[PDB]
Each structure stands twice: as structure tokens, then as C-alpha cells.
Symmetry: D2
Subunit: 498 residues, 4 copies
């Protein structure tokens, strides 16, 4: 029996584990160290959570190693590993309300959204990748023959081994699912580091793996400090692969030392300043709706949020007038209340950064059309914001806010290449989008944008089957789609002469 933090809310009784999950058991950190996790709706402490130490990281890795090398996970059929992942998906669905509620408490996710997306997308992700298990195939290859002898060459796809994955705070459960599911479907075992500010749905997910029958050690979770746990994973001889999503700083401060020692594969997702180019011949009202969703979705804590919007001169003023009208209707409130459209930011440090961000936008000469401030009310809410007359040299044309700030620049009519070049000046290349009814423009702009995802006449449309990952300083490597499996597999070539 597991210790919980029990809590009655949203007409449920939550049972929330708060310890490290190592080797199939919930256990305290070395010397029972803990830290507090904070509810962004009111500022209150939700509970105390184990704060993993170096020696705990060693234990998790050992447990993952033993589970990979000698445990059942490495001995069962691919089809059966698939069943167990599809069973974990079902357990997650049986608990969806509870997970969406913990996500609402821990991360400030509006509850109706957390059920459909934070939780809804996680379940699709395990189900999708469970179905890959017995469909991962190698090749037989028609090589030149060592006459008068014959040759056969075949490749076997095999698991890489123990993986260390670091999860960001913006969709704690969903981002955990994205990495973990492909990694696990490929046959690996894993040590997961949830972001310090958001451990709780991760720890509940751990308990759910016990309910699903996932062997002890295949999943291990270490809440605590990022630099401490990330660094030790990066340096560990037994960890073969590091999946990192996070900030550039931050970040490859303690994870530069990864390929740079005992060798390991690395995947990296590091940020974006995604452009969204809206042409005059788009469907204006739709562009306002998708345009807003591109920025405000999930309180802007959205790794692919449109970071700049370029809006063609002749529709600019009308576009802004409409966005303002729609912004006025958004309902800011507690993520549990069903009428809420816009929830609190994830934690206080990040709220403070957004307030600074907008002070700076104003200072450097952008027009603040609305918001820009903390909402007067308890917790960490921030007012949906709109800036116009943004120029390419401004800090806010380059820095990623990671919050609900719409940053709008004009471009002249008929000026495709010029706006592409401005749209491409960012050192990032995670996502991008274009709204236009015109086929020729849509396809040309999608070739020319230097980003890993291009949305056309839509935005935020991710899918568990569609690979997602950046170019340039956004990193490299894909989550989601068949393409994600390859980061978590190695190829063995076997060549016979006979």
C-alpha cells in the first residue's frame, strides 16, 4: 500500500503519490528530503514531494538496467509488450477525471482542456505506440554475392537500453507520454525526470503502471532538481540515451556533458519563436479564431505557440479590432470551473517573467493594445495580451514569451519573400503557419519556412501519428509518428555466407 496525499475536489477524492518511484515502489529520497509543489490557482502548497538525490538517480538507473537486462520486459514478445501498453492506456482512461484534476491543481490546466488534451492526448499516445510494438520491422537486403557462394543480409531493430528523459512543465502528463510511449514501445526502460514545478501527474502515472502490470523497473520517476537529476543522468555510464525538452540555458548547461564523455544518443527540443503569416486573402474570421488559439491555447504555455504574427497591411487593423473583441469574451477563472477559458500561468517565477517581458515590450516602443499584466486576483493569472507595431529588432520579436502574448507585425501587400525572410530570421525553427485561401501561396510558403512543422489554415493541430520536432536552434529528433521510434531503436546488421 502506497502513501498518498488525499484531497476532495472537483467531486472526487484524489489519491496522489508524492514519493520517488524506483523499481516498482514508492520510496523516500535519501535523508527524506522534500520540496513543496504549488497550486497556481491560489498560491497554496498542494503537498510535499520527495526531492531525489544523486544516490536515488543511481538506484533508478540500476533498477532500469536490471529490468532491461534480466527482467520480463526484455524477455516477452513484442505483441505482449504492446498489450501491456494498451492496458496502461485503458487504466489511464479509467482514471481520466482524476488525472485531469491533478493536472488542473498542479499545472493550472483548465479542466475541460486537460481532459480532452493533457489527458486525452496521452491516452491516444500510448494506444498509438502500443500498436507499433509488433510492427517494428527490419530489412532483408539484396547485397552482392560472394560467388560461387551465397549471402544473406538482414537487419534486426533492437532497443537501445536505459533512457533518461527530462519532461517540461507546460503539459506535464502529455509531454511525459510523448517521450515515454515511443521509448517503451521500442523495448527500452526508462528513468523520467518531471519538471520540478509539476511532478504530480507523473507520480500518479507511475502508480498507474503498477495497476497496468508493467514490470518493476521499466518505469522510474525522480521528482526533484533538474540540474541535479539531469546532470547525473547525463554522466551515467549505464544510460544509453537522453531525451531532453526544455530551455536552451537550462538546458544544455547540465547536459552539454552528454555525447561529451561515455557516449550517448541525445534528442533535443529547446524552444521556438514560431511565425504565423496571415495574408489578406485568408478567411478573416477563421484567422482571428485560429490566430488567437495559436497564442492563447493553454495560457500560451505551449512549445509551438505562434511567437510572432505577420499580418498583411490591408487587413491588419481589422484583424486587430477583431482579436480585441474576442479577447474581451475570454473568461478568466479557476481551472476547475466549467465556464473558465483561461487559467492561471503554471508557477510564479514564470508569471514574474511574463510581467517583465511586457514591461520590456513597452519600453522598446511596441504598442500595447491590451493586457500585459498580472490579473488582480489570487494565484498566478496573467492577462491575455496583444502588441502591435512590433519591429524585427525588438527583444519581443526574438524572445520566446511562453505565455499568452500575441505579438503582431505588419507586412506590405504582395510581399512574400520579404515576409518569409523576416519570418525565418529567428535562430529557432520549431513550428510555423500560414493562413491564405491561395493554393500557390500556401505551398510556396510551406517550402520556404524553416521549421519542423508548418500549419496551413489551422494551428496547434498536432497528432500522435504526425512527427513533431524542430530544426536550427530548436534542437532535432522527433516525438510522435513512426519517426519517433527510430530514436529509440538501434539497427544490427547480420550477414551470412553459405
Amino acid at each position: 500500500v502506497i502513501n498518498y496525499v488525499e484531497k476532495a475536489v472537483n467531486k472526487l477524492t484524489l489519491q496522489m503519490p508524492y514519493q520517488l518511484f524506483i523499481g516498482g515502489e514508492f520510496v523516500d529520497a535519501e535523508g527524506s528530503k522534500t520540496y513543496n509543489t504549488i497550486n497556481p490557482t491560489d498560491g497554496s502548497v498542494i503537498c510535499q514531494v520527495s526531492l531525489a538525490q544523486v544516490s536515488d538517480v543511481d538506484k533508478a538507473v540500476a533498477a532500469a538496467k536490471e529490468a532491461f537486462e534480466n527482467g520480463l520486459w526484455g524477455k516477452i514478445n513484442a505483441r505482449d509488450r504492446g498489450r501491456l501498453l494498451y492496458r496502461l492506456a485503458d487504466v489511464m482512461e479509467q482514471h481520466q477525471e482524476e488525472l485531469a484534476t491533478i493536472e488542473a491543481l498542479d499545472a493550472g490546466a483548465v479542466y475541460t482542456l486537460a481532459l480532452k488534451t493533457h489527458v486525452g492526448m496521452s491516452i491516444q499516445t500510448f494506444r498509438y505506440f502500443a500498436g507499433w510494438c509488433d510492427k517494428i520491422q527490419g530489412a532483408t537486403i539484396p547485397i552482392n554475392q560472394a560467388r560461387p557462394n551465397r549471402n544473406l543480409t538482414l537487419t534486426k531493430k533492437e532497443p537501445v537500453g536505459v533512457c533518461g528523459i527530462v519532461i517540461p512543465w507546460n503539459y506535464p502528463l502529455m509531454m511525459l507520454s510523448w517521450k515515454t510511449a515511443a521509448c517503451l514501445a521500442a523495448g527500452n526502460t526508462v528513468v523520467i525526470k518531471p519538471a520540478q514545478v509539476t511532478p504530480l501527474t507523473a507520480l500518479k502515472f507511475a502508480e498507474l503502471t503498477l495497476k497496468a502490470g508493467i514490470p518493476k523497473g521499466v518505469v522510474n520517476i525522480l521528482p526533484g532538481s533538474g540540474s541535479l537529476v539531469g546532470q547525473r543522468l547525463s554522466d551515467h555510464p549505464d544510460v544509453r540515451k537522453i531525451g531532453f525538452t526544455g530551455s536552451t540555458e537550462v538546458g544544455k548547461h547540465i547536459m552539454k556533458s552528454c555525447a561529451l564523455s561515455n557516449v550517448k544518443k541525445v534528442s533535443l527540443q529547446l524552444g521556438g519563436k514560431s511565425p504565423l503569416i496571415i495574408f489578406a486573402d485568408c478567411d478573416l474570421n477563421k484567422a482571428v479564431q485560429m490566430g488567437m488559439s495559436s497564442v492563447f491555447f493553454n495560457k500560451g504555455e505551449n512549445c509551438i505557440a505562434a511567437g510572432r504574427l505577420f499580418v498583411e497591411e490591408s487587413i491588419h487593423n481589422q484583424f486587430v479590432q477583431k482579436v480585441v473583441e474576442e479577447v474581451e469574451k475570454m473568461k478568466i477563472g479557476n481551472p476547475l470551473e466549467r465556464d473558465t477559458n483561461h487559467g492561471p500561468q503554471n508557477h510564479e517565477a514564470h508569471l514574474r517573467k511574463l510581467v517583465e517581458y511586457c514591461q520590456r515590450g513597452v519600453k522598446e516602443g511596441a504598442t500595447l493594445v491590451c493586457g500585459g499584466n498580472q490579473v488582480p486576483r489570487p494565484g498566478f493569472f496573467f492577462q491575455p495580451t496583444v502588441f502591435t507595431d512590433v519591429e524585427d529588432h525588438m527583444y519581443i520579436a526574438k524572445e520566446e514569451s511562453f505565455g499568452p502574448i500575441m505579438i503582431i507585425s505588419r507586412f506590405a501587400d504582395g510581399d512574400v519573400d520579404a515576409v518569409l525572410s523576416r519570418a525565418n530570421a529567428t535562430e529557432f525553427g520549431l513550428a510555423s503557419g500560414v493562413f491564405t485561401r491561395d493554393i500557390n501561396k500556401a505551398l510556396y510558403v510551406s517550402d520556404k519556412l524553416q521549421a519542423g512543422t508548418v500549419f496551413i489554415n489551422t494551428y496547434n493541430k498536432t497528432d500522435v501519428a504526425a512527427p513533431f520536432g524542430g530544426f536550427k536552434q530548436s534542437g532535432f529528433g522527433k516525438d510522435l509518428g513512426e519517426a519517433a521510434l527510430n530514436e529509440y531503436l538501434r539497427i544490427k546488421t547480420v550477414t551470412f555466407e553459405y
Copy 2:
């Protein structure tokens, strides 16, 4: 008009460029600095070769970036890009004798083997990858539809940009062909760094690209210091990818900058200590012939050479007896002579290491059955060497020699797992092999060996279609086969709503 070092040898006139190749032209290094290249058959200076300076690296990267972003390489059809590489393969084939002679001179390759492998396989590599250009395909993915609307999601495969490739010295032209052909087939442009000790086939190849009509800037070649050129390519913000093959010190102290920079895709091939396990039930004569080829091929300067042979106790002595008979028959001498079948080591420092390596073998107690020394003649020739009574803890059971040294251990009759455990004890995992007539043992052993390639009843059987690359400390990433394309492509996801 190019400047050449002209030389009448091997029934032809060599015309060898000796300068840096940048932007389609051969040019002196900054300061006109040069260095000597040495012929290992007699110790003599073949010629002076330009020594790339930092600002030469910057010019090579600039020419590569401009060819990629604005040159014709980035505009022509994939199919036409295919034609250019098939033409280049043709021009290589037209100069096959010249190229193989340069290799014999510069690397000490036995000319008949250079003709069939060093050069023959290079020509096959560009022909193979030329056939991929118009068969690199993305996907259309059946994503969830935003009803009442529709979605279409597709991936585009695109080049990554400018690549920096660092070529080892054991098969100068071949290893260069192995990295460049996949990379150019994918639509990239490249800056190549041949080993300091063997620049000449690379520079002749640069010239051949002009005859083939590869646009300027697409290939640039920087002979010189590995640490100076390697570090500068590792830091250059315009280089997206570094492919490196070489040793882990090494070598890889320089190229260990690709983490904390602009962020680059990195591939690594770092060394091996490949085991070959020979069972009592094999064809013994064939095992002798193949076991020998696995150590002595290309005078042991072969990244996949069997670094350890494990031979079952009941056939051990007879195997060693038969190897000694075969080693006595080897003809050591000038690589250009048709009788020679064992050419010189590649350069003096490597010869020195082998002599020391064998001293250390003897001092720690292994039985030197034959060889062990410099052959007493001009140039850098080393005796084909055989050690027996090797024990798992001995230095020569763990260090990669890269020389023609056969390192033999016994294992008891009927051990299968015990021998597997020993064979896997190395930190490396590049290649491996098993000789046995027993289907069960073969299949089983090949599952169990932790190495990127497993040969069964053959050895050295590489093929341009068969992916090659290591596990563990040997690195990761593939050269050859369809799998190699993917290190040189990125995936762009494009999603519409309509």
C-alpha cells in the same frame, strides 16, 4: 589549369593536386603553409600539401553554405542530382587505376586490393546513393480530423544543410565515399577533412567532381591538422552536422565541441575490439582463410578487424598450426607489385605503436607465436603477428591494435554463454563474427553479440546497401544502406485544414 605533382609510376602518369579545394578551385592555404606527405613504402616525401588554416575553414564553410542556399545544387531535380552523382561515379571509374595508385602511394594499399575495394567500392557507393536521390520519400499520415472540417498531414524530407565530415586514414577514398555519397545524395553540401597523413585521394577526388560537373562549393576539401580543422568545423555556427570517424582520444578531443555550440547533429564511429568466435563444428580450413582475412586484410588497418579470436579448445592447436602455415606464405613488399599481398603500415607513428603494442603483449605473458616486429626493409612494414594464450585481463585483449595482429584465446568445449560473456566484455561494439555449421548456435550467437554488425561464416563482408555502424563506445549512426540517408535528412511536417 590546376597545379599538379606529376609522377610516372605503375604504368601511368599520376597528376596529383596538393592544394585546398574550396568553391570549385584549388588554392593555397593562408600564408602558403604546407606539410609533407610521406610514402610508407620507402619513407620518402611524396609532396608538399597545403595546411588548412582557420580562415580557410571559414572560406570552405562559406562556399558550402552559398552552394546550398543559392547555388544550383539546391535548385535542380532530385533526379538530376542523381545523374550528377552517377556521372561522378563514372569519372571515378575512368580514373580507377590512377586513384588506386595514389592510394598505394599514399596509404600503402596493395594496388590490386585498392583497385577492387578502396576504389571499386567507392564507385559502387556513389552509384548506390545516386539511385536513392529520387526515391527519398516522405509520408501522408491519416491524422484525426477536426470535424466538420478535414485535415491532410504530410512529411517532406529535406537536406539538413552544410555538413562537415572527418575521414579516417585506413581507407582514405573509400571512407570518404562512404560518408559523402549519402550526404550529397540527400542534397547537402560538404566540407571534408581527410586525415592529415592521407590527403591525396581526397584531392584527386575533388578534381574529379569538377570533371563530373558538381557545382562549385558543393564539395570542399581541407587537408591539414585534424585538431585545427575539426575544432573549427565543430564550432562553426553554419555547419549543421558533423560526421566523425576516428579514435576516441584522439581524434575526438577536437570534434567534442558539437554539443554546447550552435547545436548540431553529430554521428560518431569511434573504434572496436570485435570478437570472432570459432566453434569446433565449423569448416576448419575456411575458418583459417576467413579468420586470417579478418585480421590481416589491408594490413589490419580496418575498423572492423577481429580484435580477438575465441577458438574452441578441441580445434585450437590445429587452427593455430594452420594459421602459421598460411602466414609463412604471405608476400610482404611494395604495394605496386603484383605479387605483394601485405603492404606497409600507413605511417611511421602507427608502425611505432604496433611494435610497442606487441612488446606489451609479450611482457604481460601472451605467447608470441610469430611476427612481433618491423620487417627489416625500407618503409613502414610490420610482421603479420599471432599471439596465443591471451587472457581476458590482458592489455592486448582490450586495446585495439589496428595492425595485423591476430589475438587468440581458447574457450572450453560446449560453453556458449561463457564465451559470449567474454566476447561482449569489451566497451566497444562495432563488429563481430561467428563460425559454425550449426544453425542454432549461429542464430543464437548473433542475437547475443552486442555489436552493430555480426558476420556468420564469413568476415569483412560489407556492402554499400548494408548499414554499418557501432553500438556502445563504438559510437552510433550508420553509414551505407538506406539507413544512412536519414542522418543527412530532416523531416518537415506539414498539416492543412480545409
Copy 3:
């Protein structure tokens, strides 16, 4: 509410529909025509079953067509089509004991086998193919560009539309699953014609589709005469594809008017005479155990049964003697009894062919070592039979028995091509096997066998991931595996200029 035939047997109460299943409902045939379905354990009538008429076929096709064109199956996401097929499989699992009992009554399947395989594999089939729905992908293709314009070319994989599938009698539910799960995963709708002698598990399966929420008209089931339903489905202009497994006779009447008017795709699995080659150096006791299975599994009613065993001269007498000891241990009895392991043949006409077949065997000179006759007991049991001295010109060396008749020929020691030539003399080429410890022999023989499946040191090891289908007169096209999907998809190429 549904009309059932209720039966209390095997500690269950069975509830078995017996009417046509069309448009989501059980209905009588035109004129309320029926026929009887016979329990082959005792020869009794289990019950009357609707006997589909021509006008019924048109209705099933119209319901299938409407389901595909306008109903929900044509509209839901691929991922949700997957969910439905998984849920179908869960429902089948909940009903497993009952479906197995039905199969025991209707087909004589031994209960334990029917549970593990007839029904076990059916469930795996549905779950495997469920996983494929959202992983069926088309392509983007780098075609030549119409300069100064650009071009984008993509393929979309789309379903073919309404499919008629004709299921054999030997594993009614399994073969129904095989030939259907893929058709549905690809988003088609289906008219299924189960064998006249075994409608029952198909109809129960129809009920389960309702329980799983498969939309109406997606699955339609028409028990009845082979030649009436087959002939009308073949001629019906709205049926786009016939899947046919069955005898050539048989066969060439029914499904042989598919080219004749409207154009349809067809897949054909027509029978086999599969050779199993047993070499002196195999493992003898395993060869006997797997040779037994190759012939006697599922009372030889097994599309891939080894119909000729060639046993090497020096082990032949010993092998025959070990086979006879094993045959003597077989417990013949009622399929519901726990200790039975040889159950009755499927139906009476088939028992009659087996008796005629063994008479011709004896007529033509082969040695009957044992069996050959109907067992003296009610129902349709057949005594496990072993023939030796079989010569290549003999009828039993060429005609498939589909019954439990081991047909043994000798081959001379150390010949390999000579026996391969004998093993390939059959006009069929569905399956084949070879037992040998020698890797070179096993790889060589497997290249040289002209059969769609070659087993090596095993037999009857089919798997839902492994495609299965024959060559030569066995037909063409695959069930199982990713390759099965392609028979049930079409490709649409979309080419843009912009």
C-alpha cells in the same frame, strides 16, 4: 432481440444465431428457406440455418455499399476505426469459451485447440490489424519540377470499397478473421460467405459486431450455397474485390467470372501439396514431433499441412518407427472431452474423399503402415494414416488430402538438388519446411523451395504479423502481416503545380 438456438453443453448455455446477417440485423432468407448444419461428432442436426438467395446477396451488397458510401465507417477517423476493431477483439475474448464450443460442435475442432488457436488467433488478428488503421501511410515523392514552377506529388491510400470474402471450412472463425480483419482495418465493408458446412461461428461473430458497436452494414454474413452466393458476389457490379480461399474445382465455377464483366480485384488461395524435407543431420525426436504436427494438427484440415515428407535414407526407417509410436498414443474422441487430441473430420463428404483417397493410395502401390479408414464410431472420425514407399508419379504424391495422412518418400543420402527438384515438382506452392542442423543447407534449401512460406526446424508456426499466401497453382496475394493491407487499399496520386 435476436432468435437463438439454445444449447446447453460444455458447462455453458450457447446462444447461436442461425439467420442471414444483413444491414445489422438477423433476418430470414427469401421464402424462409433453410438447410441443416451437422455436428460431426455424432452426425446429428445441430439446427437449421437460413439459406441465402440471390435477392439476399443483393441486399447484403446494398447494405455494404451504403455503409461504405454514407454510413459512419466511411466518416470516422482511422484511429477510431482501430478502436472499434480492438473493442471487437475484446468482445471476442469475453466470448471465447463460447466461440470455441461452437467451433467444436460445428467443425469438430478439439475444444482446447479451438480455444488456443481457432479463437486465440482470431483475437490476435483483430488486435494486430486494429493497430494498423492509423499507420497506413501514403508518400510524398520528389518528381521532376516544371521549371520555373514547382510541383508537389503525394499518394493517398484509400479503401477499395465493398469486398466479398469466401471463407473455407477448416478453421471457420480463424480464416474468417484472417481474411477480414485486414479488409476492415483498411476501411472497407464486407459481404462474407462462410462455408455452407460451417456457418455457426460466423453468425455468432456477426452478433459480436453489434456488441462492439461496429456500424450497421459494415459486416454482412450470408450462409448458404457456395455456388449461389459466390457466383452472385462475383458478378455484382458494386463489389470491387473478391477474396477467395477454397479448392480449385470449386472455385473455378463460383469465383471464376470475376474478370468476365465489371472488373474486380481478386485474391486466391487454392490449395497446396507442401513438402517437408527431413535431413539425416536434424534433431530426430524434434523432427518426429514436428512432422507429426505438420500432418495431424487440426485433424489434417489445415491449408499448410505437409502433404509429402521426404526423409533422408539413413534415418528413414528409424523415423517411421518413431512416428508409429507417436500415432499409437493419439487419443481419438469427442472434441469436448479434455483428453481428446484427434477429433472428427469436419463433415461427411470430406470423410468420403479421405476414404477414396486412401483406397487409391493402396491401389497404386504405396505401403499403408497404418490407418486409412473411417473409425468405427458414430460421426465422421478418420484413423490417423501413415503411407511409406510413396513414389513421385503416384496420385497421393500429387493430390492434396486435407486429412490426417502422412505421405512419406525416401531420398538418397547427401543429395540436395535432387530432392529439391522432387519437392518442387508439385503444381502447388503454398508452404514447405526443412529440418536440418546445417545452416548452409537450411539457407540454401529455403532459397530453392518454390513456396510462399518456408519453415526451418519448425512447422505450422504462422503468426498474425507474418504474411501467408502461395505461389504457382496455390494462387497469390497475402493474408496476415502488413502486406495483407495492400490487397485492400488503392493508391491515389495527387500532383500539384504551383
Copy 4:
């Protein structure tokens, strides 16, 4: 030496083989039977051509079989098979002017166009598929393991055997290339039946296979009667696969004895009535240019020609007026005049059908805006023709003309589903087209069109890498692209237990 028909023409001395090509030699038919081949520019006999007899077919088949089972083609490496096909493409390119002139003479292809496409694209076809040969791969499949044993499953891709292909007369060399390159790349051997009225480039092509070093018997060529050759090929027990393309009649008489014998795989391309839908928001002048091409290219002898143009109501009249301004500029005459735009029809009987087809369109009420007739001048020229006021029930809205007849109907402004339903009403489904600037209409229409190829804002843009084949009564199977290969390969599954 080969016997030639020699002709001084187009600054060349053509040398034209004219016999059957069997076993790598040119030979008279049995009884020295011949027929004449007619030049459509003037109606004169080019030369007598051997007229294949039944025993000739058996000979070609036996030569193909022997080439496949015992000759070099079946023994060489895949990679070396590719080099032969590349070399064949080279020899074809060395003879391009001569191939084009033979096509201008035999088929009436305009010379400039024959160079660039009839011959141009043939060469690309061979080069494209040559690249496929060593890239055709099987799989290794993670099936369930028979614990405590292991299993390994792999598939081998293998040639099907002897193929018979029947080639249409509209693009004699090109269709031969499309239908044969893929068959050969996959390892097969072939008997080719060129259309009786166009044998000459096929036979010239056969001579080129000799110069390219294709082994004897791999390619055989039987000019003569379609019914006789097609039918004997359909019955032959040693032909595994028939590739047919031609009219449904025509057709079926012949190619429809493949089910009713010794089973064969068949691929069918049977005709088109492809719609082109031109919306009011397209670029109008472009639509005129592309719409004209869609009909008049290759004098409308084009299996994918647009047989109905649907033009939105508000642009209809201006589109027709612009079409008529362009038709008047078309230059009609000798295919060897370099300013010729429109050559003569391929043979007389097809010109007579074209005159009858136009009389039938006028009779049943359509408006003849221009053309409709034979151009008065020697040979078989027909005038480029435009019909308006075409209604859905008319003969010319349903029957494929195969001539230069533009067939125009209006569709109401802003309807989409209604124009789709009319465009889909044809029983054919080979190609289609939509011209529109609107991305949403383009995507939607491309989804809904029931056609194997949809062109968007272009037309006739086929490409050797893009699969080409129809739906519905147009047949099934693909030529071109990787998908073509699969029609010509079979899959062998090989499963081991160890």
C-alpha cells in the same frame, strides 16, 4: 547481321529491324507471314513486319523461361542487373534521335515531342527502375516466440517469373518502357506484344537490348495480332503474369482467359473518361493553356486525356472564346516539321471512329464550336475539336474518344458537390484534374474524385517516380513509382525456430 529496313530520313539513315525477336535473335514468323505497317502522315506502307504465329508465342515463352530459370539474368547480383538496365538507358539515349524518328514515322508522334517525351521519358523510366534493383527489400518481423525456443521470421522479395505484356499504340516506346522497366528491374523476363499498328520502335528497342548486353531471352518481342498473341499468352501455363493496357473490348476477348486456366496475376488498364473541373477562381489564360494540353497533347491519343471539361458558368464563355483563339494558332502537319503542333492520328480505323464520334455528338444535340472532321490533306489528320452544350446523358459525355476533341459542360457557380457527382458518374476512374486558386476547393475536390490520379493546376504531369493506374472500370495495378515494383515481385516468408 540483323536484317534492316533502311530509310534515309530526318537527316538519318534509319535501320529498322522488322522480324520477331525471340531468344536474342530476330527471326521470321512461322510460314514467313507478314503484314504491313502504315505511315499515318501519307498513308504509305513503311515495310512488311513479321506476323507472330501460335508456335512463335510458345517459342518466346520458352526462351523467357529458360532465360529466367537457367540463364545469367537469374544468377547475377541485383546491383549488376541495375547496371545492365542503366546501360540500356544509355544506349537508348545514344539512339534517341533515331528512336524518335521511328516513332514519328510509325505512330505519327511529332518529332520534337517524341524526343522530349516518347523517348525522353522511356530513358528516364529505365534509369529510375535501374536504381531500384538493389533497393528492393524484404523484412524481419517480430513474431511471437515459441518459448522456451526462439523464432526468426523474414520475408524475401523475389521475381514472379515469365511475364507477358501487351502494349497500347498511343505511345509505343513509352508504354513499353513503363510496362517493362519495372518488370525487368524486379528480375523477371518478358514477352512483349506491341500493338499491331505500331511495332517499329519495339523492335528497334529489342536491338538495343543486344547492344546493352541484356542476356538472350530476357526480352522477347512478338509483333502481330492482338487476339492471337494475347490469347496464347493468357493460356500459357508458363506465364505467371499478364500486364494488359488497351480497350475493354478488345481486351477481354483476349486477356480474359487468365482466371479460367493455370492461375496468373493480371494488371489491367482499360480506358478513361477523365474529368477536368475548371473553377471561376483559377488563372484563366493558364487554364486555357493547360486545358488545351489536357485534350490535344499527342493528338489526344493519351490514356489520361481529359474527356470532359466542366467549366464554371461565369467563365464558360470567355474560356471557350480563348480556347478558340488558341486552336486557330495550332500548326498541323508532318510530324517531322519542327513547327508542327498537331500530328496525324495513329492509323486509319481510328481516324474513321473519330469522324463517327463527332457526328454522333452533333446528332444527340451538342454544339460543335470547331473542328469535327478529317483535315483534308494526305494521311489521317483530324481537326482539333471543341464541343459545348454537352449534357451528362449524351454518348460523348460517356465514351472515350481518344482523339483531339475538347468536350465541355457548364456547372453552376459555387456548386462543388454537384460538379463532383457529375465528374464521378463515369464508369472509368483513370485520371482527373481541378484548376482553382482556392486551396480548400483543391484539397476537397482531390479527396472526392474517384480517380487514380488527380492533377491540381496542371495536367499530363506524369513522372517516372509517381504511381499511375486507375480505379473502377479503368482497371487496377500501377505502372511507375515504387508501387509498380510490387506487381512484379512475390513475397516468401521464411520462419526458423532455434
